[PDB]
Amino acid sequence: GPHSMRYFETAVSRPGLEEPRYISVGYVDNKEFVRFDSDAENPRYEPRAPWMEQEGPEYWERETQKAKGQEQWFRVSLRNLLGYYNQSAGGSHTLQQMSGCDLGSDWRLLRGYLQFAYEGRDYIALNEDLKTWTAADMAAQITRRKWEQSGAAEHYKAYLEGECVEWLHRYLKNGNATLLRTDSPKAHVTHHPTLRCWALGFYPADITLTWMELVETRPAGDGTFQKWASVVVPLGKEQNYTCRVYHEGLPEPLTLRW
């Protein structure tokens, strides 16, 4: 199947301050493996996954210095967006970035991604060709002209076909065991004045419950997830429905009733 790496970066300007808050989070196959946060007393890039402790000191020193450089880059770009949009530095503003790559079934680069959002809305994004930009509005068109003139797309396309694929290959080799894990859900059913099917303790988050109301899948905090789906039965007719749960951790899909 496919695989992916992503980095989610966030900068928030702080009025009357020079340094915005900068947070950077790494993801392999949508699982967080690294994080940096400018809020710490001595901020340092840190492993969020067991298999990342296999990397040595030069790794964490280098990623740390990179992150401080990115904090500066977002500080600049924030100042520029104030001008494009004629805003005041008296307000807090938010800039976000998603970058990384998807490897196909053949482990070759399938798709590269680089995109930015301002105030939580799409601003500019590098296209599938890793050559051209899509700008979201008139302000982003300024940036797009700038980046055309500077050839920034080349820098990114190099990274995406570069380091992104390499380091992803290596993060897959390192994280192999852990990343293949599946915890099967444990399920049960409750009656109310309304019957409810609970799936608890499962990983990864993709799951199907079928009898109806349902809640978005939620973290338990312990590395597993929870979901439930319910109906309103005809109050006298019990075994009103059967609850099936399909999840890739189950030897077979479960079946339950009240």
Binding site: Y7, E63, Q70, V76, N80, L95, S99, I124, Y156
Partner: peptide
């Protein structure tokens, strides 16, 4: 491995 951004916005 974190990408390093190019030209500023």
């Amino acid at each position: 491995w974190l990408v390093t951004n190019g030209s500023y916005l």
